[PDB]
Structure formats: C-alpha cells, structure tokens
Enzyme design. Structure first.
Site: not given
Lengths: 386, 384, 387, 386
Positions: D52, D104, D177, D202
């Site tokens: 992690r 979004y 973004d 995306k």
C-alpha cells in the site's frame, strides 16, 4: 499404518522457488512476469517460452514436492502426455494401463497410432500380463494408480521392477488422483511423475495445467528440449495461480482425506449402495498395497448404486451440494456419471471389461463441511431409491 | 498502390465476439472465465472450450475473413497441432527460410515419426512443382520470411499446390498480421499466426492462432486442439483479445515508422543493403503491393563491416532494445546468426543470407524522430 | 473448550455467491468481470464502481462468513476505516482502542482530527475507562481485539452492552487477527465487523483489500452510499483472488491455530523468552474470555525476548524460515519488531505505556512444518543467547 | 492551428518507468508484483516495505503518467473518485472549495453531500465567466476545482487565465480534471494548474476494463502531503490494474489520434444533418470556445455532444436504432458508446442552469471504422424522423 508423511513437504511447498533474493524488491511472493522477451548483452532469460521466472519458480517447487531434480510445466495434462510421447520415434511400442483418463486413452489410439507408434492396452495390475506385453521395441509404459474412474491400484515399485529389466523403458506414473503429498512415484522407481495440475495440484478449479517431474539427466534434457520445441507451455499467470494453490496443497489434501474417508464409509454402510471403491477403505482390493505405497488418500470416491441408470440419474439430479460436473480435485464437491460424461469417449466393449457400467458414479469429495456432504448424499439416495 | 484496406476491420476487431448479450450482466467487455468445469443438467471443460477463448477465436476468424479459428498455447504449439493433421508416410515441403523453431521442429522432431521433410525455395515457383510428390500433403510457407523477408506469391503458390491431390497450404502470417495480408483470401488453406508478436502486440502473451475455411479441415483441427491440449489460458486469451482492439491503429503506426526506418537506413553510408517489403528496392516489392494492404515494422539490413561492427552498433542502441521476439510496441534489435537463428545450420545460414552482419529490427511505436536518431548515433558509433 | 465451531462455515465459504446459475455458461467458478460499464435498455449493473459481478459475489460470501446480511469490499483495510469514519460529521467524537494498528492510530490522530472530529484513545478493556469517556457527542467506538501487537482482548458483548445504552453509537470491531472462522463480532453485538482482508481473509500475501460487514439496514445504506461516493473500491481481479483465498480459510486458520499454539508453547518454556502473549495459552490474561468469545485462535504470537534491542535484532537477523518483514496472516511465517517497523508511527511515550518495548517481537506463524518452525526459533534464539 | 504536439509523448509512454535494469531478469515489460510485503534487513540492505505504501508495478505506472503530464510526480488511486476524495483531504475544517458549475455528477455529489458535513464550505461558480470567481474567492478558499471541457455540455475554461487569477490570492490549489482530453491533448500543469487529475478509467486506460484515478503534480510540498494521504487513506489500485493501465498507455497516442479523427467526422456529419439542432464539439469552429481550444490543446478527443430535434420520445428512439453505438454509461474506450445524460449521468432544478436538457445526447466515439459509425448514425436518425 500408511507410509509416514514426507518430511518438510509443507515447508518446501511454501518456500522452494519463492526466495525473495531473486527479485530486486525482495518480494515475499514472486512477481508475475508476463514479458515475452528479455534484454541481453549489456540474468539468463531469453524468451518466455524457453523459460521465464514465474514458470521456473513453480517448476522448482513442484520438483521438491515430488522429491525430483527437475520439473516441467505444460499447457495441460494432455499436453504433458503428448510431450512425453514425443520422446519416442516411429516403430516404438507403448504399453498403457487399460483403465486410464479418457483423453489419454483417446490420444494413444486415435493420434499416436497414426505416426508409427504401436500401442497395447494392458491390465498392468496383474503381474505378468505386463511382461507378456513387453517386447524389445517397448519404450514407454504409461500407468495410472489409482485408475480413472474404477481406481485400480498398481504396485509402482513392483511394476517398475518388471519394466526396468528389459533395457531402456520409461515408466510413467500419472499421479493426478493422489498428489505428491500422498504418493511419490519417483521414490518407488518410476522414471516420470506426471500430473494434470488442473485437479488437486492447483486445487481451485481455475487453471488448466500439466506437470512432469523427473530425475534422470538425459530424460530431463530431452523433455526440456521438447518443452521449448513443441511450445505447449503454460501462461505465467497460470503458473502463478498454480504455485499459489500449491501453498495450501498440504492442508487441502488432508481435508480431502478426512472428508473422502467419511463419505466412503457412509456409502459402504448405506442400504442403497452396491459397492464402494476407496483406497482408504479396508474393503478395497489393494488397500494393503495403498498403505505400503502412500501416506494417505485423496477425496476421489467411486461407488456403484443399486438399480439401473434410472436410479443413478435421479440420484445425481437430486444432489443439492455436490455439483453435477466434469473434472475433479477442487475445493468444491463434484459428482459425475462416467458412462455419459468423462469416459463416454471410450467405447462400450471397453467399458464392460473395465467395469464402467451405467451404475458407476464417481465422486470428487470437496472441502465443505462433512455434515453437509453426508446429508446431501443421504437425501439424494433416498430420492433415488424411495 | 497497395491492395485496398480490408473493409470493416476496425469494427470487427472491436465488436466480433464481444456481444454484451452473451452475459447476464450485459457487460461491454467479455468476462475472464477461469473455471475449468461447468454445471450440467453448452460448456463441458475449459480445455474443450470456454467463453473467453471462444470470443477471441470468433474475433480472430473475422479479422482473417475465415469461418473458423483455433487458439493455442504458442505459435510453435499451433504448428505442432497443424502437423498432427498428417500421418506416417506423408511428406512436408517447407520454405528454406523459416522461423528457426519451425525449422527445428520439422528437421529434428517431426522427422522422427515417419514424416519426410524437404526444404525448398518456394520463392522460385518452379522448384516447388519439382518438389511436389504424390506423398506430399502439407506445404508450409512463410511470407515475408524470417529474417531475410523473401516474399512468396501466395495465390500462385496456392494454384500449384491445389492443382493435384489433397495438399494443405499453410501461410505463417506473423510478420504482416491480418490487417496487412489475408492468406485465406489468396488461396491458402490455413492462415496461422504466432500471436506472441503483432496480434497481441504488447509483449506479454505467448499464443498461437490458426484460421481456416474448410469445414472438414476445421473438424480435424478442433479434434486435435482438444486431444493434444496445447491450449491457451483464458487470461491470455483476454489479453490477446484486448490487444486486437488496437491492431489496426498499431499496424498503421508500425507501417509509418517502419518505412521511415527503412528509408533512413538505405540512404545511410554505413548500411550495405536494406530488405523491407515497402521499399521499391525489395526484389518482390510489386508482388507485395499486389498481395498486401501495407507493410509491418520488420526491417532487416546488412551493416557495413564485420561481426565487430554489427555488435558495436547493437550495443550503442539506447531506444531499440537488444532482445529476441518482435511485434510489440517497443522497438527491438537482434543479430539473428547469434540469437534467433543459431539453431539453423551455419552453411544453411550462409545460403539463406543470414551472415554476421545481417541485423533484424522490429520497429515499434515510439516517436519516429527518436527512433531515427537512435539508429543514426549507433551507426556512427560502429564506424567512428 | 472454545465456542463450538460455526455451522456450515466451509460450505458457505465455498458456495455462497458462487452459484453457477448466475452465468450463461454455468461455470462452477464465477468469471472475472473487468468491464467498467454495461449495456443498458435492451442485470442491475450500470458502472463497475457502483457494483460489478465479481465484487458482489465476494461481498455475499464474506457476509455469510460473518453471519451478516450485508458486506462491502474496499481497496484496503485502511480504506475501509476511512469510509466508515465518513459516516460521521463535524462535531462528533470517536473513541479508539489504545493499542491499534499503527495506521488506524495515525489516521484518526493526523487526518480525521483536522475535519471537526474529536479523537480519544481509551483502554476499552477496562470497562470504564470507557463509560464517561463516552459523551453525548460520541458517535463511533472503534475497538480491535486482540490488539496489534500486544494482543489485549476485549469482551465484545460486554463492550457492546455499554456502548448501545447511550443512544446512537456505532461499535466497530477490527476482526483482522481472528477472521470470521474464529470470531463473529456481529453475533456478539458489534454493529460492524471490519477486516484488513490483506491479512488472513485472503491469506496469500498478494492482495490488498478491506472488508466491512454489517447488519443494520440504515447503517448499510449509508455505507453503501459512501462506497460508491468515495470510490475506494477494490479491483475485480483482487476480489476474485480474495474469494479464492476464502475457499481455504477454514483449513488455513486451523493450521495457523495448531502451529501458533506450538510456537507459543515452545517460546513460553524457552529460557531466553521473558514473556509470551498468545490468546490460546492459559497464561494469557483473557484466555478464558477468549474461549467464551471465539472458536479458536490465529497464528499471531507475541513475545518478549530476554535482553535488549541488540538481542531482538540478533534473533531477527538469524531467522532462516521466518521472514523479517511487515504484515501478517499469510501462508508464510513472518517476524518483525513493532517498535522499529509497524508501530514506529505511534509516539514513543504511547508505546512504553502499551508495552511496545524494544524487546517486543511479533510473529505471524504460517503453515510450514511445525518441526521446522520450532527449530528456526530455537536456533535463532541460541544465536542471540549462546551457551 | 492547435498547440504543437508534445515532443516525446510516444517514446516516453512506452519506455518511462519500463527500464529492464530494474529487474534481475531484464524483462522488457515490468513484472506484476502482487506481494503485499517485502523482506527487510538482509546483508547489504532501502527498498520496499508494504504494498500500500508503494510497490514496483504501481511505481512504474506513476513514473510513466508523470512523464506524460510533464509532471515531476504522479499518484495512482483506486478510482477517479478516490483521487478527488484524497485531494480534498489536503484541506481542513473551515477551508472553502470553489467548484465548476458543470462537473461530473460524482464530483458534484461528493462536495455537496459528504465534504460539506466536515467543516468544508462548497460554492458552485461558473468559472468560464471570468469574474464570478474572485467574487467567490475569499481568504478561506484553499481549493479550486475545474473540469474542462465539461461533462457533458463541454464548456471550455481558459486554464492559464483561470490559474493566473487563482494564484493571485496566496495559498490556493487549482485542480483540472483532465479526463475528457487526456495528457495527449491537454497539459494542465504546463498551463499553470497545480494538480492534473484523471479518471484513468476513461481514456488513459482506454479499454473499459480498469477503474482508476491519477493525479500528477510538480510542487514538492503538495506532492509530499498528497503522498502521505495516499498511504494514510489507502484508496490504492491493484498492481494488476496498475499493469493493465500502463499496458493501455502504450497505445494512448495512436488511440487518441483515431478518436480525434473519428470524433471530428462524427461531429461534422451530425452538424449538417437535418435532424440535429446543435452540436457541441471543441474541434468544430461552431464551438463557442473553439479558438481557446486550439490555444491550450494539441487536438481533441472523441466526446461529441449534440441536441436532437424534437424532444424525448424522438431522442431515445434514435438510441434504440443505434447498433454500433452501445447504450451505456462511461466513455473513453475503443468502443463507441451513446447515452442520454438527463436519465443516466446527470439524473443524480439545475437541469438547464447547466443546459443539460432532456434532448441532450452524449456520444463517446470509438475506434471503429468511420464509415460504419456514420452509417449507424445516419440510419438511426432516419429511423428518428421517418
């Protein structure tokens, strides 16, 4: 008194090939190397098919579990069988156990025979029906103990003794049903311990893979050449997934042993079962040979149901926990009727001689609670014979 | 004036086999089905057939203009399965310049099982007719060849092979990909690929592919796929099918970059000769334009000097990687006489042309500018 | 004489969420669905993050193992914690067990406190230092039993009893060290059973993941909203791998118990060990509470070596089977010194109060051969303390 | 005249972070390292601690993306949403966030319904109109969140202008973004932004099989805080997803170029179609900010938005006759996707303060044949008004 369990098995299964010093990160788990090629000429890796880290790690581990010097991984057990056969030449003769996996038997008779290989199917359980079938042109003896699915047991050390007295003959033991945790065919004199890792080895019903362990140097070099030259090699991701499954092989096989025995004992004392075939049961014809030859037994339980196929099929349809499916050796319990399914490729006159009748059911006993496995066998037998 | 591009290639590469209605979830990308077995009351066993492998096979077949397609654990494995179509006593005619492993399997393994193997220059169309025998049942050609990239008239060769008897003609279409060449449309019986190269295109999958139109040929091949078991993992099938979705746009970039490299190398004073199908200097360039919609990124050339200059050139490359294999997004470089074709006999290498100065390049998708300067600086290093 | 083993655990771990009828192929093992999106308006799947087949199968199976109605999977055990805390709002107070995983300690103290949350670290084993640490602003009690790494044990049912008398307060039990095969916090009154699936749940050292199991309907709806809203979701492939490890959880935990018991016993009679802390040993202060609350014990063995930091390092450097490394709960045996490694993030004066000294060593006993494990520990202790 | 293409994009997308000298094997593709933990304290050992906190496969991906953004640093996350949540954990109780009017839905919902409950004040401002922004800037504003072009009305914001304004007020972070454009077509950091954030789900991955977020940064202190929050909140992606995403980057340049080519053709075909009222596409001169697009971008993606004439019942029967475009949510893959945002992306009365009417249709133009995509659009519009 079975054979005492093999020493360091659990330790070797978890650590052999997994040394973190192999990787610059010192990862406790070996990374999955998908790279097909490697940079040269500025360790010893050239091309993925010829060798790649993740596959090599699994090979080193499986060898240790077999007590072997070398191991080779393959795209499937079938592909492992085909690669071994490529060790021969035209004119050589192959002796094969009369009851084997369908595809093994289908490959020898339909494919290998077309290329100058003569193949004789012999009951190698019976001592010198084997030596009656051996000729100076025999090069490979392919036995499978216990057998699929009637689970006949062969004395590996004795059959090896018969085989190795006739010049150069490769004895292969298909150890799929037992796993090296319970049986080490190389310690018993066999030349090649071979697995469909698809079953118990990976153990998680999500990898098609074959394995070939071997001690003899020339036998290894020839097999190693054929691994690269025929290209029937597994994905590195599959090699990783199988190595992962190996890390629990010892606790899985012991649970398979405990559940399988419970299922086998329940079936034998059941009023609707004609006969139970389980190497762990004293009623098995070779049970004393099993204990001298193995440290335990897997969860493959074969039995004959009373009645006809109408009762065999109502039984399978009423199972709620066992899954009616092909294959074996995973954490989930599987049930199957070999007459219609796994051994439907063998023709019936060979079905009648080996015992694969329409009432012969094969069980792969899984890792679910013994309570639940018995109750579903109970309920499903009561629906078949009400 | 190459052959016009195959219609609907991009649309088929992305959608064939990928129908969302195959799955309860209606996922737009097919799931990876690892399961070895299936509940019975049309899948039985993963080796026999499984969703993810079937979707990939359906999609590849569409790209080949084929009715059927079979996937395999490797290109080599696909070849071995194809050869299992035969029987003891048959004869095999193989291109004299073929991939080293193809060469090695026929010469050292298949000959052990009652198969006669003859290596013949099928570029010369009249040496093939002399080699064809009533016991000939398989003709294995590669075009362009690896690594000297001789080009074979597939349609003319197919006319010779198919004029008499039941003889399979296989074209190893690895160097071109079905985006630039369709051997089945030209008369071949089997269109075969090492998907390890251009098809997957991402240097992370070992896989073979076999496309065919004859239904009886397919039934035998399908039997051998299950019977021999050289099958590919479903996860590899997924990754390859994932690679396919960009084959058209990568192969177009491979063409542009490869032509740039080939044209640079030919005008470079340290280069004795260039072999690239897209160059007019290629002996069969007009045949290529008649047979192909374009060319790949495989450029082979001869460096001026000795083995010493070939090595200095290869050790000074900083973008091209000194490595085996081909067809990835990364540019690769290799000396075939020491690396991929050391398994081929030496006096078979010097009649093939695989000398100490023959270098094969796999031009990737990096910036053309960077690729050209890397070659320039490395050639300058080899000849100070 | 532990609690009787939970009934049908193995059967549920292998079959729940794994029904072949979900798939057109009727595959025995659920496929790995990577697809980010789904075809609409020709299936209750819109977008991978809100939900997807492989993750849903895993959540259904974990819930069955926890005896829960619902479960939520997350990108890490850390990410599960962060999501749970987002249930609150500015002004609320959090009571945290005093001995926790370092990262849980640091998140509350360094991050959550900066957003209008009050954090109080309290010894919840003393059943009031807990009661009036509770204020009307207490919305969340976060406990972890056994604790990491001093393995103190809390009476969950007793703790749950205290917490639920003061209105709407959430009691979360980090059940990482035990797994649901050995302890079911929801059956004992906790509102949330939380896991670092990275450890025993997956058990194969190759997946980072967190799991959150819950019964309350409104509590679930708020958590389900936050899983989608914050996006700390796990990969479908990791969801598949974790579900694959779950299939062997029962056989794995049972061997962890037998090996961990053997390691703990060997250490306690060993002349170079000052003190062993293992819930399965009768010498543990809450051993009896453990047997009334659990069906067994994991492989986590904590002990104190005789001597100083030098001996702890000599011991650790000489292990040949145990791997000097962080984390726990896999098939391989691990060893580590919390003061210098996993709990270096908690302040030094808070470790001397918890007992996390320079001689404290934490072992994650794996599934190797018991004989080989004991001989590794034996040889490594003799190296630190030779004749 | 778009911005000249970034100079080493393809080379760096293929080699940055991919160096085979990182691995003992010299693999040319980085191995996937699943291992959660790494051996420590060996002779001569400084490396990795815990997956992690950091791990090879993720680090190679973060190095590559940073190069593509022209950034010094990058951090990968379980999702674009998780990146957004991690970024706002940079603030504290009392700080203010300015967010674009049209973002979004998840970004919009997270600020209103979650972040506001923790001492954070949220103001939604039309940041395209220069000076409602500093009218909104207070001494308590610490983070400005813009998204250009917008989803789905595709308004375009002057990033350099907006960054210039914002950076006049001291300590304040501007976040862009960059999902819709990808770093192939737009580099927010070179334009003055402080953080460049992506939903790698995306275009970055571009294969519709990975959920992932990315944030790229230059400022040392911003990175150090961000890196701390990555490990502390633990919203990290799988190494396999990190591998798959980096695999997807290798074709990002040729994918975006075909997206541009097909998107342009689709936008131009739609605009001269008698059944289309209005097309919004930054590549066409009819776009309100077309001149700004060419000044801050090197090209355009495949997101084409248009209004169909008539209203609802005619708007959706067009979607039902599409047989190449798939009715589905999300965008940026090789696949062509179509969707009506009033029911799907922004169904979560700000319907026409944003302009997101009932008749607005969003297309994600894939990499299929341009011929088939236009014919699919033509037929579906002929079915629309027969």
């Amino acid at each position: 008194g079975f054979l005492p369990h093999f020493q360091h098995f659990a330790t070797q299964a978890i650590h052999v090939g997994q040394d973190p010093e192999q990787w610059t990160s010192r990862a406790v788990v070996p990374p999955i190397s998908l790279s097909t090629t490697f940079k040269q000429g500025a360790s010893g890796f050239i091309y993925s098919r010829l060798g790649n880290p993740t596959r090599n790690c699994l090979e080193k581990a499986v060898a240790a579990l077999d007590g072997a010097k070398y191991c080779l991984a393959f795209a499937s057990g079938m592909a492992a069988t085909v690669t071994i056969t490529h060790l021969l030449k035209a004119g050589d003769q192959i002796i094969c156990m009369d009851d084997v996996y369908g595809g093994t038997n289908a490959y020898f008779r339909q494919v290998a025979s077309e290329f100058g290989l003569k193949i004789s199917f012999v009951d190698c359980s019976k001592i010198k029906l084997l030596e009656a079938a051996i000729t100076p042109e025999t090069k490979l003896v392919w036995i499978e103990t216990p057998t699929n699915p009637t689970q006949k047991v062969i004395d590996i050390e004795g059959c090896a003794h018969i085989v190795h007295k006739h010049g150069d003959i490769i004895l292969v033991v298909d150890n799929t049903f037992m796993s090296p945790y319970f049986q080490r065919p190389l310690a018993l004199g066999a030349d090649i311990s071979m697995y469909s890792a698809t079953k118990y080895m990976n153990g998680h019903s999500d990898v098609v893979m074959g394995l070939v362990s071997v001690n003899c140097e020339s036998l290894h070099n020839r097999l190693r050449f054929l691994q690269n030259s025929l290209g029937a090699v597994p994905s590195p991701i599959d090699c990783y997934l199988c190595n992962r499954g190996l890390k629990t092989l010892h606790v899985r096989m012991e649970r398979h042993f405990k559940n399988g025995m419970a299922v086998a004992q329940f079936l034998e004392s059941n009023p609707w079962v004609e006969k139970v075939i389980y190497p762990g049961l004293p009623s098995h014809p070779q049970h004393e040979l099993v204990k001298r030859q193995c440290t335990g037994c897997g969860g493959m339980v074969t039995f004959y149901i009373k009645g006809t196929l109408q009762h065999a099929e109502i039984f399978l349809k009423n199972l709620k926990l066992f899954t009616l499916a092909v294959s074996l050796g995973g954490f989930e319990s599987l049930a199957e009727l070999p007459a219609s399914m796994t051994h439907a490729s063998v023709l019936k006159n060979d079905r009648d001689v080996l015992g694969i009748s329409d009432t012969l059911i094969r069980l792969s006993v899984g890792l679910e609670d013994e309570e639940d496995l018995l109750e579903d066998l109970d309920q499903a037998l009561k629906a078949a014979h009400p």
